[PDB]
Amino acid sequence: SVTMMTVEEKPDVTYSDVGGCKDQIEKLREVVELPLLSPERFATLGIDPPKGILLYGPPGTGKTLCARAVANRTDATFIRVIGSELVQKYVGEGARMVRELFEMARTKKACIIFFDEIDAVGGARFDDGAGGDNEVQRTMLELITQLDGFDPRGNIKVMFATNRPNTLDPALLRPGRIDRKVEFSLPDLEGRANIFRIHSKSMSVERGIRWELISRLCPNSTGAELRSVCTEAGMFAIRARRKVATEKDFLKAVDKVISSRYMQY
Amino acid sequence: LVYNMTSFEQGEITFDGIGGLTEQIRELREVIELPLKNPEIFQRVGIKPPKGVLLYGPPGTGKTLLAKAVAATIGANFIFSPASGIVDKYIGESARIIREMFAYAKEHEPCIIFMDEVDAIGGRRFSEGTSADREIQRTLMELLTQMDGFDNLGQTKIIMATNRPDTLDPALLRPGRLDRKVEIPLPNEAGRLEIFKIHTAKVKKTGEFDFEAAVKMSDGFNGADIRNCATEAGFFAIRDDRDHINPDDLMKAVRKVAEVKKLE
Amino acid sequence: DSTYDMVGGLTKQIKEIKEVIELPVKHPELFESLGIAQPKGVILYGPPGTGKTLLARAVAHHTDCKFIRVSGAELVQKYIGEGSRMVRELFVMAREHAPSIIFMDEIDSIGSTRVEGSGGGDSEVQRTMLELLNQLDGFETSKNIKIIMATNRLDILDPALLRPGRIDRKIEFPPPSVAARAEILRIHSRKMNLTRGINLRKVAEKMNGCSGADVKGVCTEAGMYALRERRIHVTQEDFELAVGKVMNKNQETAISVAKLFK
Amino acid sequence: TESYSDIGGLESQIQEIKESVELPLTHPELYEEMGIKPPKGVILYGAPGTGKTLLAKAVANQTSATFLRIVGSELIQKYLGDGPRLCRQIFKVAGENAPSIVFIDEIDAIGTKRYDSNSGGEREIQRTMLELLNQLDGFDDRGDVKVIMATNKIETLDPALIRPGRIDRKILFENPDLSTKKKILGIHTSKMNLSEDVNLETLVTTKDDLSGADIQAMCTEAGLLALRERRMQVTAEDFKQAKERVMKNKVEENLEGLYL
Amino acid sequence: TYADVGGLDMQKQEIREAVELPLVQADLYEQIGIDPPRGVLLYGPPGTGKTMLVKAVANSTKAAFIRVNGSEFVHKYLGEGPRMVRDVFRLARENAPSIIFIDEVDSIATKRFDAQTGSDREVQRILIELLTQMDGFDQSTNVKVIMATNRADTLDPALLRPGRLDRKIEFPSLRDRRERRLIFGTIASKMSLAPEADLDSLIIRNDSLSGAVIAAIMQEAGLRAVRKNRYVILQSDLEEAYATQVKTDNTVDKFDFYK
C-alpha cells in the first residue's frame, strides 16, 4: 500500500547540471541504461551484466541528484524505498514490506528502484551477533535471501547509497548481492569550473570574471559548498544594496564557508 | 528441557568399558559414592560431605567421559557451563547465569555441574582495564558466595575441569573446598592396547591385533587418536570392499594420522 | 520534620536563601516596582556531613509553598526517551501550583560533564531540563518556579547548570568555627539529662574543624558509654574521650612514607 | 515574547537571521532580482551565556508566520519505530501550514557521530537522525520552511547534517568584547535609579572574563543587596561587591604567568 | 550460632546490642532522649570470621532479614539497579522492624573518582541510591544495616560518618595465639577425636592462620583417616595436615616470580 505511494513522478534535473563527475556516470549508466536500452552489444558476447551496483562518497558530494537525474531520463518506473518505511515496529509489519517491495518489482518489467541511505538497515552489522532478538538481523537476511542463494529476477536495476560504507555487511560486496562500488569523491579544477557555471546561470552578474582565479582559491570542497558561495556572494551586494554582483564579492564570500595567517610562505 | 541432557540418572555408559585408570576413578569413588552410599560415618564424625574437585590436564585423557559415567553409576544429572560460553560483554549477566543454575539445579532434586575451560574465570589480569577487570572479579566473586552459602545439601555436587592449571594466579581458591585435585595421567604405552581393546570391540575383522601400535601410539597418546584410527582403519578395509580388517591398516592408521596429532 | 532552631551553625547562608525565595512570593511588588529581574534557584556546595540536606527539609516546614523532591537517580530509567518525559511531566505538575519549589538532592549522578564514548540517556535528559529552565516556554516556567540542588563538589559538573540566568547564587557550606561547632552540641544534647557541672566549649576547641555530623556521633556515643553502666546521666571525661577517639582512626591511614620528594 | 531593543550587542551576528527569515517575507523581490533564493537553514554555535535562545524567541515576536517549539529530545520515542515517523509529521504539516519555521535546540542530544554501538537503543536515534536527512534535503524539495537550530558545542559533534543543502550559515557567539559590554549594560539598568555614581566605563573592563548573561545577575544581585540596607536606589559600590563575588570562580591563571 | 563461633569474645558483643537491644529495649535510649544508631560495618581480611556471625544473628533476631551480596545489584539495562535498591528499603520499612545484610560492597563502595565512562559512571549512581535513602528527607526508625567487606580503607568518606555508620568494628589479624587455642578446642570438641591429642603442639607455631584454613585442616585431616576404612577417630599423625595447609609452597608466583 504505502509502497505504492513512494514513486518519483518526474523531478526536473539533467546531466547538464553536473560537472566534475564526467566519468563516474560512465560507470553508472553503463549498468542501468544499456541492459535496459542496448542489451544486444553485451549479447554479442553473451554475458551477464552486473546488477545491484552501489555508490559511496563523502557528504554533499553530489549523489542523490544523480539518483533522480536518472529518473526523468529513462522514462521508466523509479521507486524510492526510503527510511522510516522499512523498520516499523510490530515485527512482520516491518520485513513484509520489503517482500512486498520486490513483489511489485517482480511483477513489473523495465523497473529500477532506489534505496536511500541503506546505512540504517544494511549498516546494522550485528554487534558481534549479540541480542537474543535482533529485529534488523531478520530483515537484512531476507533481501540477501531475495538477492543471493538463488536469482531474484533477471531485468531489474538496483542502486544503493551510503555516506558511510564501512558499516554494512561483508556480504554486500559480493555478486548477486553487489557488483560495483562506485566512489564519488572530491572534484578537481576542471570539474569545479563547470559546477560554478550552472549555479550562476540565473545569477545577475556582469562579466569581467575569471573563475580560474576562484578554483585556484577554493581548495578541496564539495559540490554543495560551491552553491553556498553563489548565495552569500550574491547576498553581500544586497545588504550593500547593488542591483548586480562583482567578482571581489566572491572573494569575501569564499572566505566564510571554507571557515591568523601562514606568513611563512 | 532447556539447557542440558541431565542423563535421566540411568543412561548407563560403562565407566569400566574404557582404557582409563583404576586409581583415580577409585580416588573419586571416595568423595561421591561413599557418603551417598554410606552416611553412617560422616554422620558419626559429623564432617560435612566434600566440596568439589578439579581435574587438570589437556584432552585425550577422557576427563569428561568418566565424569558423566560415574554420575550415571550414582545417578545424578549431568550438565555443562563452559566458561568460554558463559562470559557476556555486559556488566552483569555473567553472574546472573551463575545464579540461575545454582537455583535451577536445586529446582531439580539432585544435580551436578561440569564446568570446563574455567581459566576464563581465573585470569592473570595482565591487561588491567579497570572498567573490565573490576567486573571480572565481580562475576567470579559471586561464584564464591553463590556456591557455598546456606546450601546444606548432600546432592548438589560440583566439578571444574581446567586445562592449563596454575595459569590462574589472581586467586588459587585453595582453602576449604576442592578436597581433591587429581593428579591426572596421560595414556601410557601400556594403556594403548587397554584402549584399543575398547573401540575394537563390536567388530568382525579377523582380529586386527599388533604390538606395532603403541610405538605408533607413542606421542599420539590421546583418546581421539584411537577413536579416529579405528574410524579410518575401518574406512580402509572398505577402501577395497574387503570383509575384515587387517592389522596393517592399524599400523598404517596410527602411523599416518597421528601426524596431525603431533604437528598441530 | 525538623526546623530552623535545629540548623544552627550559621546565619549568613540561610539569610541568603529566603533573600531569593520568600521575597518574590510574598513581596514582588517592590521587586516589580524596582522591576528588574526574577532571581531563580540556588545551589549549595560543601563537604559531607555539614547540613546541606538538613536545611532543605527544614525549609519545607517553613515555606507555605509546594516542595517537590527527587532523590538520587529516580529519573534515569531503562527504556529510552522517557526519562525526558519523566521530566517535562514534572514541571507541568509544578505550574499547576504556581508557587512551587523543587528539590533534587544530588546531581553528580546526572549532571556530570558530557562525553561521547559513553553516557547516553542521562546526557540527554540533562540536555532538556537545561532547556526547560531557560527556554521559550521556560520563560513561562521561569515565572514562579524555584530550584534547589545540593552537590558535594561542583568542578565535576558542566558550567551550563551553574551558569547564571538560572543559578544566581552558589553557596558554600564549609566546616564550622569553634562557636558554631560548640552550639550544635546543645542542639543534639538538650534532650539528654541534667548534665552535671559541665563545659562544652573547652572540648570543641579541642576538636578542630572536622565536620558537623561527627558531632552528632560523639554525643550519641557519649551517652552510650554511660548507657552500658545503667548510668543514665552524663559525664565530662566521656566527651573528650570519644572525640579524641573517633577521629584518631580518621587520622590513621593518612600517613605514608613513600617520599619520592621533599 | 521579548523584542529587539533588548540586546544591543549582537549586530555582526544578527544581520543574517534578518537575511534568512525576517526579511524575505517582506521583500523577496531582492533575492530574485539577482536570480537567487535565500538559505534553507541556520545554526548557532555555543559558548554559553551569550544569548542564543534569546535571539530565536525575538523573531517569533515579529515574524507574521507560524513558529514552532521543539527541543532535540522531544523527537525520540520508546516504541523503537515511531520516532522517525514523528519527524516526517512535523515537516509535512509545516508545509500544510506554510510559510513556517522550526526550532530544534540542544540537538547534541541527537546529533552525534555514527558511533557504531552494540546497545540496542542508541541505534533507534541514529535512524531518527537519518530520516531527517532523508527528509530535509534527501530526494525532494520541501518548500519554504526554515530551520534555526542551536547547540552548545560542535567541535566534535553534528557530523554531516552541517553542510549546505541543509544549513548554510553558522553564526557563532562568544563572551563579548569590551565595546559591547557598554551598550548591553544600559539594557538591564534602564529602569533603576543610578543615584549619581555611574563611572561605568571602568566598572566593566577587560580581564573581567565574564559572560553576556552574568551581568543581569550582577544588576539584580546589587539592588536587593542595597535593599537590605533599606536603600532602594543604587550607587557604585553596590556593584563593586557584586562583581567581586560572581567573577570569583570563573577562571584562574595559575598556569599563566609563564609567558613572561 | 553464637556458641558455634570461637574467639570473638569482643566483637560478638557490639552487634548483639546494636541490633537486638534497641527493639527489645529502646525506651531507655530515649529515657536519655537520643537517637540510636542505624548502620555498622565489619571490615577485616577474609577467613577472619565475619560472614558467619550475622548468620548466628539470623537464627536469633525475631525480626526480618535480607541477604544481598554486592554483585547482585548490577544489570545491563541501566536505571533498574536503583529501583531494585529502592525496592529493598521499602520492603524493609514495610516488614518493620527489620534489618539488612550485605556480604560485599567493595564492588560498589569506592572513592568516586572522576569518571569518563558509562560503566564507572553507572556504578556510582547505584551508590547514590543508598545515600539519598540512608539520609535524605524520608527516613525511619526501624531499619538497620549490616555492611561487610574484606577490607575498608577506600570506600568513600561520605558513606563513612555518623548517621550512616555509627559503629564500625575491626577484626583480628592471623597471628594472635589466644583465640587460636580457642578455635581448635571449639571445632575439635564438636566431634570425637583421639586421646593422643597433640593440639598443644600445633598452636605454638609461628604461622599465621584464619578461621577458614582451620575448617580445611581439621576437615581434610578428618578426610584422610575416615578414608582409611576407619570409623571415628583421627590419628595423631595428622602432621600431613598442617604441612598440607602450606599454600605458599603451592604458589610458583610466590616461588619464582619477582627474581
Binding site: K89, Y90, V91, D133, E135 | K89, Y90, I91, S131, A132 | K78, Y79, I80, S118, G120, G121 | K78, Y79, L80, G81, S117, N118, S119, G120, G121, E122, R123, E124 | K76, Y77, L78, G79, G118, S119, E122
Partner: peptide, 16 residues
C-alpha cells in the same frame, strides 16, 4: 486479535 506484541521497544545497555 489482541496479540499486541511488546514491539521490541528498545532500551539502553551498558557496555563492557
Amino acid at each position: 486479535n489482541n496479540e499486541n506484541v511488546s514491539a521490541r521497544l528498545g532500551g539502553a545497555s551498558i557496555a563492557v
